[PDB]
mmCIF file of all heavy atoms in Angstrom:
data_model
loop_
_atom_site.group_PDB
_atom_site.id
_atom_site.type_symbol
_atom_site.label_atom_id
_atom_site.label_comp_id
_atom_site.label_asym_id
_atom_site.label_seq_id
_atom_site.Cartn_x
_atom_site.Cartn_y
_atom_site.Cartn_z
ATOM 1 N N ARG E 185 -19.675 12.432 29.403
ATOM 2 C CA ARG E 185 -19.540 13.547 30.332
ATOM 3 C C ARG E 185 -19.787 14.876 29.631
ATOM 4 O O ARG E 185 -20.450 15.763 30.181
ATOM 5 C CB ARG E 185 -18.157 13.523 30.982
ATOM 6 C CG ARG E 185 -17.982 12.385 31.974
ATOM 7 C CD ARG E 185 -16.671 12.493 32.730
ATOM 8 N NE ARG E 185 -16.612 11.551 33.842
ATOM 9 C CZ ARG E 185 -15.631 11.502 34.734
ATOM 10 N NH1 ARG E 185 -14.599 12.327 34.674
ATOM 11 N NH2 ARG E 185 -15.691 10.606 35.715
ATOM 12 N N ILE E 186 -19.269 15.030 28.412
ATOM 13 C CA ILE E 186 -19.472 16.275 27.676
ATOM 14 C C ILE E 186 -20.955 16.491 27.406
ATOM 15 O O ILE E 186 -21.504 17.563 27.680
ATOM 16 C CB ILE E 186 -18.657 16.267 26.371
ATOM 17 C CG1 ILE E 186 -17.162 16.338 26.685
ATOM 18 C CG2 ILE E 186 -19.074 17.428 25.483
ATOM 19 C CD1 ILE E 186 -16.268 16.083 25.490
ATOM 20 N N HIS E 187 -21.627 15.472 26.866
ATOM 21 C CA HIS E 187 -23.059 15.599 26.612
ATOM 22 C C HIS E 187 -23.838 15.744 27.912
ATOM 23 O O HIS E 187 -24.777 16.543 27.993
ATOM 24 C CB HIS E 187 -23.563 14.394 25.823
ATOM 25 C CG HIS E 187 -23.120 14.382 24.395
ATOM 26 N ND1 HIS E 187 -21.797 14.263 24.028
ATOM 27 C CD2 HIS E 187 -23.823 14.476 23.244
ATOM 28 C CE1 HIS E 187 -21.705 14.284 22.711
ATOM 29 N NE2 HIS E 187 -22.920 14.412 22.211
ATOM 30 N N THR E 188 -23.465 14.980 28.937
ATOM 31 C CA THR E 188 -24.168 14.998 30.219
ATOM 32 C C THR E 188 -23.666 16.186 31.034
ATOM 33 O O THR E 188 -22.809 16.068 31.914
ATOM 34 C CB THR E 188 -23.968 13.685 30.961
ATOM 35 O OG1 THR E 188 -22.568 13.399 31.060
ATOM 36 C CG2 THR E 188 -24.662 12.549 30.228
ATOM 37 N N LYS E 189 -24.218 17.359 30.724
ATOM 38 C CA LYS E 189 -23.891 18.579 31.446
ATOM 39 C C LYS E 189 -25.108 19.396 31.846
ATOM 40 O O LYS E 189 -24.970 20.298 32.678
ATOM 41 C CB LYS E 189 -22.960 19.469 30.608
ATOM 42 C CG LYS E 189 -23.575 19.964 29.305
ATOM 43 C CD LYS E 189 -22.727 21.051 28.659
ATOM 44 C CE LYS E 189 -21.438 20.497 28.076
ATOM 45 N NZ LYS E 189 -21.690 19.603 26.913
ATOM 46 N N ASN E 190 -26.287 19.116 31.287
ATOM 47 C CA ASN E 190 -27.484 19.893 31.569
ATOM 48 C C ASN E 190 -28.629 19.078 32.145
ATOM 49 O O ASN E 190 -29.489 19.654 32.821
ATOM 50 C CB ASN E 190 -27.978 20.590 30.291
ATOM 51 C CG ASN E 190 -26.907 21.444 29.644
ATOM 52 O OD1 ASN E 190 -26.033 21.983 30.324
ATOM 53 N ND2 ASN E 190 -26.966 21.568 28.324
ATOM 54 N N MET E 191 -28.670 17.770 31.907
ATOM 55 C CA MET E 191 -29.747 16.950 32.443
ATOM 56 C C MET E 191 -29.718 16.960 33.965
ATOM 57 O O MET E 191 -28.654 16.878 34.586
ATOM 58 C CB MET E 191 -29.626 15.516 31.927
ATOM 59 C CG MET E 191 -30.076 15.339 30.491
ATOM 60 S SD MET E 191 -29.246 16.464 29.355
ATOM 61 C CE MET E 191 -27.582 15.813 29.396
ATOM 62 N N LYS E 192 -30.903 17.059 34.569
ATOM 63 C CA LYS E 192 -31.042 17.011 36.024
ATOM 64 C C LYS E 192 -30.898 15.559 36.478
ATOM 65 O O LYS E 192 -31.819 14.931 37.006
ATOM 66 C CB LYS E 192 -32.375 17.610 36.451
ATOM 67 C CG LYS E 192 -32.547 19.070 36.055
ATOM 68 C CD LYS E 192 -33.969 19.563 36.296
ATOM 69 C CE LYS E 192 -34.331 19.576 37.775
ATOM 70 N NZ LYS E 192 -33.439 20.466 38.567
ATOM 71 N N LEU E 193 -29.697 15.028 36.265
ATOM 72 C CA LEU E 193 -29.449 13.613 36.501
ATOM 73 C C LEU E 193 -29.694 13.253 37.960
ATOM 74 O O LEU E 193 -29.326 13.997 38.873
ATOM 75 C CB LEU E 193 -28.014 13.259 36.115
ATOM 76 C CG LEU E 193 -27.592 13.612 34.689
ATOM 77 C CD1 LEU E 193 -26.137 13.245 34.465
ATOM 78 C CD2 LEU E 193 -28.483 12.916 33.675
ATOM 79 N N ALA E 194 -30.325 12.103 38.172
ATOM 80 C CA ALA E 194 -30.458 11.567 39.514
ATOM 81 C C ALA E 194 -29.122 11.006 39.987
ATOM 82 O O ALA E 194 -28.218 10.726 39.193
ATOM 83 C CB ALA E 194 -31.532 10.481 39.555
ATOM 84 N N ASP E 195 -29.002 10.836 41.304
ATOM 85 C CA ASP E 195 -27.758 10.333 41.873
ATOM 86 C C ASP E 195 -27.395 8.956 41.336
ATOM 87 O O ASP E 195 -26.225 8.565 41.397
ATOM 88 C CB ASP E 195 -27.863 10.284 43.396
ATOM 89 C CG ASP E 195 -28.181 11.635 43.999
ATOM 90 O OD1 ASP E 195 -27.825 12.660 43.380
ATOM 91 O OD2 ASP E 195 -28.786 11.673 45.091
ATOM 92 N N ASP E 196 -28.370 8.213 40.812
ATOM 93 C CA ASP E 196 -28.135 6.868 40.289
ATOM 94 C C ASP E 196 -27.551 6.983 38.883
ATOM 95 O O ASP E 196 -28.240 6.856 37.869
ATOM 96 C CB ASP E 196 -29.430 6.065 40.301
ATOM 97 C CG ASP E 196 -29.303 4.747 39.574
ATOM 98 O OD1 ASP E 196 -28.492 3.902 40.006
ATOM 99 O OD2 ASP E 196 -30.019 4.554 38.570
ATOM 100 N N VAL E 197 -26.243 7.233 38.832
ATOM 101 C CA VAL E 197 -25.505 7.352 37.580
ATOM 102 C C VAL E 197 -24.293 6.436 37.649
ATOM 103 O O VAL E 197 -23.548 6.459 38.634
ATOM 104 C CB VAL E 197 -25.069 8.804 37.302
ATOM 105 C CG1 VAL E 197 -26.288 9.714 37.194
ATOM 106 C CG2 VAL E 197 -24.102 9.292 38.379
ATOM 107 N N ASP E 198 -24.096 5.636 36.604
ATOM 108 C CA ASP E 198 -23.003 4.671 36.510
ATOM 109 C C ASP E 198 -22.264 4.848 35.192
ATOM 110 O O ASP E 198 -22.024 3.895 34.447
ATOM 111 C CB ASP E 198 -23.521 3.243 36.647
ATOM 112 C CG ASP E 198 -24.212 2.995 37.972
ATOM 113 O OD1 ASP E 198 -24.123 3.864 38.864
ATOM 114 O OD2 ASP E 198 -24.848 1.930 38.124
ATOM 115 N N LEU E 199 -21.893 6.095 34.888
ATOM 116 C CA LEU E 199 -21.334 6.411 33.578
ATOM 117 C C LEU E 199 -20.157 5.514 33.222
ATOM 118 O O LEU E 199 -19.970 5.177 32.048
ATOM 119 C CB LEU E 199 -20.902 7.876 33.536
ATOM 120 C CG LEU E 199 -21.997 8.901 33.832
ATOM 121 C CD1 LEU E 199 -21.437 10.308 33.757
ATOM 122 C CD2 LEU E 199 -23.167 8.737 32.878
ATOM 123 N N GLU E 200 -19.347 5.124 34.208
ATOM 124 C CA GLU E 200 -18.211 4.255 33.919
ATOM 125 C C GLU E 200 -18.683 2.914 33.370
ATOM 126 O O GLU E 200 -18.137 2.404 32.383
ATOM 127 C CB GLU E 200 -17.365 4.053 35.177
ATOM 128 C CG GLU E 200 -16.584 5.281 35.616
ATOM 129 C CD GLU E 200 -17.470 6.360 36.205
ATOM 130 O OE1 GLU E 200 -18.706 6.183 36.205
ATOM 131 O OE2 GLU E 200 -16.931 7.386 36.670
ATOM 132 N N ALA E 201 -19.706 2.331 33.996
ATOM 133 C CA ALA E 201 -20.251 1.072 33.501
ATOM 134 C C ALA E 201 -20.842 1.244 32.109
ATOM 135 O O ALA E 201 -20.684 0.373 31.246
ATOM 136 C CB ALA E 201 -21.304 0.539 34.470
ATOM 137 N N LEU E 202 -21.532 2.360 31.872
ATOM 138 C CA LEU E 202 -22.094 2.613 30.550
ATOM 139 C C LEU E 202 -20.994 2.665 29.498
ATOM 140 O O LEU E 202 -21.116 2.072 28.421
ATOM 141 C CB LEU E 202 -22.886 3.919 30.560
ATOM 142 C CG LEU E 202 -24.037 3.992 31.563
ATOM 143 C CD1 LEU E 202 -24.720 5.346 31.487
ATOM 144 C CD2 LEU E 202 -25.031 2.874 31.316
ATOM 145 N N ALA E 203 -19.904 3.371 29.800
ATOM 146 C CA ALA E 203 -18.793 3.441 28.860
ATOM 147 C C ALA E 203 -18.189 2.064 28.630
ATOM 148 O O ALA E 203 -17.852 1.706 27.495
ATOM 149 C CB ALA E 203 -17.734 4.415 29.374
ATOM 150 N N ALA E 204 -18.042 1.277 29.696
ATOM 151 C CA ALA E 204 -17.453 -0.050 29.552
ATOM 152 C C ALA E 204 -18.313 -0.946 28.670
ATOM 153 O O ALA E 204 -17.792 -1.663 27.808
ATOM 154 C CB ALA E 204 -17.255 -0.685 30.928
ATOM 155 N N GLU E 205 -19.631 -0.923 28.871
ATOM 156 C CA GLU E 205 -20.509 -1.810 28.114
ATOM 157 C C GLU E 205 -20.729 -1.311 26.691
ATOM 158 O O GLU E 205 -20.796 -2.114 25.755
ATOM 159 C CB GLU E 205 -21.848 -1.961 28.833
ATOM 160 C CG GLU E 205 -22.642 -0.676 28.933
ATOM 161 C CD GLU E 205 -23.854 -0.817 29.826
ATOM 162 O OE1 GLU E 205 -24.133 -1.948 30.276
ATOM 163 O OE2 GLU E 205 -24.526 0.204 30.082
ATOM 164 N N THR E 206 -20.845 0.001 26.506
ATOM 165 C CA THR E 206 -21.074 0.561 25.178
ATOM 166 C C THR E 206 -19.845 0.313 24.314
ATOM 167 O O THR E 206 -18.824 0.991 24.464
ATOM 168 C CB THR E 206 -21.382 2.052 25.267
ATOM 169 O OG1 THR E 206 -20.368 2.710 26.038
ATOM 170 C CG2 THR E 206 -22.740 2.280 25.910
ATOM 171 N N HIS E 207 -19.941 -0.657 23.413
ATOM 172 C CA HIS E 207 -18.864 -0.999 22.496
ATOM 173 C C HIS E 207 -19.357 -0.810 21.072
ATOM 174 O O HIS E 207 -20.411 -1.339 20.702
ATOM 175 C CB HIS E 207 -18.394 -2.437 22.709
ATOM 176 C CG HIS E 207 -17.327 -2.870 21.754
ATOM 177 N ND1 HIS E 207 -16.107 -2.236 21.666
ATOM 178 C CD2 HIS E 207 -17.299 -3.871 20.842
ATOM 179 C CE1 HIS E 207 -15.371 -2.830 20.743
ATOM 180 N NE2 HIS E 207 -16.071 -3.824 20.228
ATOM 181 N N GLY E 208 -18.597 -0.066 20.275
ATOM 182 C CA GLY E 208 -19.009 0.213 18.917
ATOM 183 C C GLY E 208 -20.047 1.303 18.788
ATOM 184 O O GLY E 208 -20.856 1.268 17.857
ATOM 185 N N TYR E 209 -20.057 2.266 19.705
ATOM 186 C CA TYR E 209 -20.963 3.407 19.644
ATOM 187 C C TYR E 209 -20.166 4.656 19.299
ATOM 188 O O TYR E 209 -19.229 5.020 20.016
ATOM 189 C CB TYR E 209 -21.702 3.596 20.969
ATOM 190 C CG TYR E 209 -22.941 2.741 21.117
ATOM 191 C CD1 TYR E 209 -23.173 1.663 20.277
ATOM 192 C CD2 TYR E 209 -23.885 3.023 22.094
ATOM 193 C CE1 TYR E 209 -24.304 0.887 20.409
ATOM 194 C CE2 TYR E 209 -25.019 2.253 22.233
ATOM 195 C CZ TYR E 209 -25.224 1.186 21.387
ATOM 196 O OH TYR E 209 -26.353 0.413 21.518
ATOM 197 N N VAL E 210 -20.542 5.304 18.199
ATOM 198 C CA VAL E 210 -19.936 6.564 17.786
ATOM 199 C C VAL E 210 -20.586 7.693 18.571
ATOM 200 O O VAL E 210 -21.620 7.495 19.217
ATOM 201 C CB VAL E 210 -20.081 6.778 16.270
ATOM 202 C CG1 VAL E 210 -19.410 5.644 15.517
ATOM 203 C CG2 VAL E 210 -21.543 6.883 15.881
ATOM 204 N N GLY E 211 -19.988 8.885 18.522
ATOM 205 C CA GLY E 211 -20.515 9.993 19.301
ATOM 206 C C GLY E 211 -21.966 10.297 18.982
ATOM 207 O O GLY E 211 -22.763 10.586 19.880
ATOM 208 N N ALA E 212 -22.331 10.230 17.701
ATOM 209 C CA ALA E 212 -23.718 10.474 17.326
ATOM 210 C C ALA E 212 -24.648 9.476 18.002
ATOM 211 O O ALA E 212 -25.716 9.848 18.505
ATOM 212 C CB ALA E 212 -23.867 10.403 15.807
ATOM 213 N N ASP E 213 -24.257 8.201 18.027
ATOM 214 C CA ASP E 213 -25.081 7.196 18.689
ATOM 215 C C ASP E 213 -25.205 7.484 20.178
ATOM 216 O O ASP E 213 -26.267 7.269 20.768
ATOM 217 C CB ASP E 213 -24.499 5.802 18.457
ATOM 218 C CG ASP E 213 -24.748 5.295 17.050
ATOM 219 O OD1 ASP E 213 -25.401 6.013 16.265
ATOM 220 O OD2 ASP E 213 -24.295 4.178 16.729
ATOM 221 N N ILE E 214 -24.132 7.965 20.805
ATOM 222 C CA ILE E 214 -24.194 8.286 22.227
ATOM 223 C C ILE E 214 -25.153 9.443 22.473
ATOM 224 O O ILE E 214 -25.935 9.428 23.434
ATOM 225 C CB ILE E 214 -22.785 8.588 22.763
ATOM 226 C CG1 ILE E 214 -21.946 7.310 22.756
ATOM 227 C CG2 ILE E 214 -22.870 9.171 24.160
ATOM 228 C CD1 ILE E 214 -20.496 7.523 23.111
ATOM 229 N N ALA E 215 -25.105 10.470 21.626
ATOM 230 C CA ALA E 215 -26.051 11.571 21.768
ATOM 231 C C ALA E 215 -27.482 11.082 21.590
ATOM 232 O O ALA E 215 -28.386 11.494 22.329
ATOM 233 C CB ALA E 215 -25.730 12.673 20.761
ATOM 234 N N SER E 216 -27.706 10.200 20.615
ATOM 235 C CA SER E 216 -29.040 9.644 20.419
ATOM 236 C C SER E 216 -29.483 8.846 21.638
ATOM 237 O O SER E 216 -30.656 8.883 22.024
ATOM 238 C CB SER E 216 -29.064 8.767 19.169
ATOM 239 O OG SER E 216 -30.343 8.188 18.980
ATOM 240 N N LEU E 217 -28.559 8.102 22.245
ATOM 241 C CA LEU E 217 -28.882 7.345 23.448
ATOM 242 C C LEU E 217 -29.283 8.273 24.585
ATOM 243 O O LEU E 217 -30.241 7.997 25.314
ATOM 244 C CB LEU E 217 -27.687 6.481 23.850
ATOM 245 C CG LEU E 217 -27.835 5.566 25.067
ATOM 246 C CD1 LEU E 217 -26.775 4.483 25.024
ATOM 247 C CD2 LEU E 217 -27.736 6.342 26.371
ATOM 248 N N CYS E 218 -28.554 9.375 24.758
ATOM 249 C CA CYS E 218 -28.935 10.344 25.782
ATOM 250 C C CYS E 218 -30.317 10.918 25.497
ATOM 251 O O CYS E 218 -31.138 11.077 26.411
ATOM 252 C CB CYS E 218 -27.895 11.460 25.863
ATOM 253 S SG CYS E 218 -26.295 10.936 26.519
ATOM 254 N N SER E 219 -30.593 11.232 24.230
ATOM 255 C CA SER E 219 -31.906 11.758 23.874
ATOM 256 C C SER E 219 -33.004 10.757 24.201
ATOM 257 O O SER E 219 -34.050 11.124 24.747
ATOM 258 C CB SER E 219 -31.938 12.117 22.389
ATOM 259 O OG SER E 219 -30.908 13.035 22.069
ATOM 260 N N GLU E 220 -32.782 9.482 23.877
ATOM 261 C CA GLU E 220 -33.794 8.468 24.146
ATOM 262 C C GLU E 220 -33.971 8.253 25.644
ATOM 263 O O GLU E 220 -35.085 7.997 26.111
ATOM 264 C CB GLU E 220 -33.426 7.158 23.453
ATOM 265 C CG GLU E 220 -34.512 6.098 23.534
ATOM 266 C CD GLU E 220 -34.236 4.906 22.639
ATOM 267 O OE1 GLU E 220 -33.141 4.849 22.041
ATOM 268 O OE2 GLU E 220 -35.116 4.028 22.529
ATOM 269 N N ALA E 221 -32.887 8.345 26.415
ATOM 270 C CA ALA E 221 -33.013 8.235 27.863
ATOM 271 C C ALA E 221 -33.851 9.376 28.423
ATOM 272 O O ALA E 221 -34.709 9.163 29.288
ATOM 273 C CB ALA E 221 -31.629 8.218 28.509
ATOM 274 N N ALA E 222 -33.616 10.598 27.942
ATOM 275 C CA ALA E 222 -34.432 11.725 28.384
ATOM 276 C C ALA E 222 -35.891 11.526 27.993
ATOM 277 O O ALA E 222 -36.805 11.825 28.776
ATOM 278 C CB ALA E 222 -33.891 13.027 27.795
ATOM 279 N N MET E 223 -36.126 11.024 26.780
ATOM 280 C CA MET E 223 -37.490 10.747 26.347
ATOM 281 C C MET E 223 -38.149 9.721 27.259
ATOM 282 O O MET E 223 -39.318 9.865 27.626
ATOM 283 C CB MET E 223 -37.486 10.254 24.900
ATOM 284 C CG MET E 223 -38.867 9.961 24.332
ATOM 285 S SD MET E 223 -39.975 11.380 24.396
ATOM 286 C CE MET E 223 -39.066 12.569 23.415
ATOM 287 N N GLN E 224 -37.412 8.675 27.635
ATOM 288 C CA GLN E 224 -37.964 7.658 28.522
ATOM 289 C C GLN E 224 -38.286 8.239 29.891
ATOM 290 O O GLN E 224 -39.314 7.908 30.490
ATOM 291 C CB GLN E 224 -36.981 6.494 28.652
ATOM 292 C CG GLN E 224 -37.515 5.300 29.424
ATOM 293 C CD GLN E 224 -38.569 4.532 28.656
ATOM 294 O OE1 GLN E 224 -39.114 5.022 27.669
ATOM 295 N NE2 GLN E 224 -38.854 3.314 29.101
ATOM 296 N N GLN E 225 -37.409 9.099 30.411
ATOM 297 C CA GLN E 225 -37.668 9.705 31.711
ATOM 298 C C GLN E 225 -38.920 10.571 31.674
ATOM 299 O O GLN E 225 -39.758 10.506 32.584
ATOM 300 C CB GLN E 225 -36.461 10.526 32.158
ATOM 301 C CG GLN E 225 -36.672 11.279 33.463
ATOM 302 C CD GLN E 225 -37.151 10.387 34.592
ATOM 303 O OE1 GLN E 225 -37.927 10.816 35.446
ATOM 304 N NE2 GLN E 225 -36.683 9.143 34.611
ATOM 305 N N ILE E 226 -39.069 11.389 30.631
ATOM 306 C CA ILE E 226 -40.274 12.209 30.541
ATOM 307 C C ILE E 226 -41.500 11.329 30.333
ATOM 308 O O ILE E 226 -42.589 11.645 30.824
ATOM 309 C CB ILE E 226 -40.143 13.271 29.434
ATOM 310 C CG1 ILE E 226 -41.389 14.159 29.408
ATOM 311 C CG2 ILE E 226 -39.924 12.622 28.086
ATOM 312 C CD1 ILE E 226 -41.238 15.406 28.566
ATOM 313 N N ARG E 227 -41.353 10.218 29.609
ATOM 314 C CA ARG E 227 -42.461 9.281 29.463
ATOM 315 C C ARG E 227 -42.895 8.744 30.819
ATOM 316 O O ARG E 227 -44.092 8.667 31.114
ATOM 317 C CB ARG E 227 -42.053 8.131 28.540
ATOM 318 C CG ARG E 227 -43.158 7.117 28.279
ATOM 319 C CD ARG E 227 -42.670 5.919 27.477
ATOM 320 N NE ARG E 227 -42.440 6.239 26.071
ATOM 321 C CZ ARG E 227 -41.253 6.480 25.529
ATOM 322 N NH1 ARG E 227 -40.141 6.444 26.245
ATOM 323 N NH2 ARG E 227 -41.179 6.759 24.231
ATOM 324 N N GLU E 228 -41.931 8.366 31.658
ATOM 325 C CA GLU E 228 -42.263 7.886 32.995
ATOM 326 C C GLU E 228 -42.945 8.975 33.811
ATOM 327 O O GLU E 228 -43.915 8.709 34.530
ATOM 328 C CB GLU E 228 -41.001 7.401 33.709
ATOM 329 C CG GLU E 228 -40.344 6.189 33.073
ATOM 330 C CD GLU E 228 -41.155 4.922 33.250
ATOM 331 O OE1 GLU E 228 -42.271 5.002 33.807
ATOM 332 O OE2 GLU E 228 -40.677 3.846 32.836
ATOM 333 N N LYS E 229 -42.456 10.209 33.708
ATOM 334 C CA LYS E 229 -42.985 11.308 34.507
ATOM 335 C C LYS E 229 -44.271 11.901 33.944
ATOM 336 O O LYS E 229 -44.859 12.774 34.591
ATOM 337 C CB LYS E 229 -41.934 12.413 34.635
ATOM 338 C CG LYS E 229 -40.713 12.023 35.449
ATOM 339 C CD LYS E 229 -41.041 11.894 36.929
ATOM 340 C CE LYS E 229 -39.792 11.628 37.752
ATOM 341 N NZ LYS E 229 -40.083 11.569 39.209
ATOM 342 N N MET E 230 -44.724 11.462 32.766
ATOM 343 C CA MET E 230 -45.911 12.067 32.166
ATOM 344 C C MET E 230 -47.130 11.935 33.068
ATOM 345 O O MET E 230 -48.035 12.777 33.013
ATOM 346 C CB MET E 230 -46.202 11.431 30.805
ATOM 347 C CG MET E 230 -46.921 10.081 30.867
ATOM 348 S SD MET E 230 -47.422 9.468 29.246
ATOM 349 C CE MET E 230 -45.837 9.325 28.429
ATOM 350 N N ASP E 231 -47.178 10.890 33.897
ATOM 351 C CA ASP E 231 -48.380 10.613 34.675
ATOM 352 C C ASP E 231 -48.790 11.824 35.505
ATOM 353 O O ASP E 231 -49.954 12.241 35.483
ATOM 354 C CB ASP E 231 -48.147 9.399 35.574
ATOM 355 C CG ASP E 231 -47.728 8.170 34.791
ATOM 356 O OD1 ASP E 231 -48.104 8.063 33.606
ATOM 357 O OD2 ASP E 231 -47.021 7.313 35.361
#
Side-chain angles (χ1 to χ4, degrees):
Chain E
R185 289 187 170 186
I186 291 169
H187 288 65
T188 53
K189 63 169 72 67
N190 305 330
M191 284 54 69
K192 299 171 65 60
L193 305 178
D195 302 333
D196 171 62
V197 299
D198 300 350
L199 302 180
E200 289 72 356
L202 302 179
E205 64 189 354
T206 52
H207 177 60
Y209 276 15
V210 301
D213 285 358
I214 292 173
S216 178
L217 182 161
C218 291
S219 304
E220 187 170 6
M223 181 57 59
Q224 187 72 345
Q225 176 53 214
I226 183 168
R227 182 186 287 101
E228 295 290 4
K229 293 289 185 177
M230 80 173 61
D231 303 332

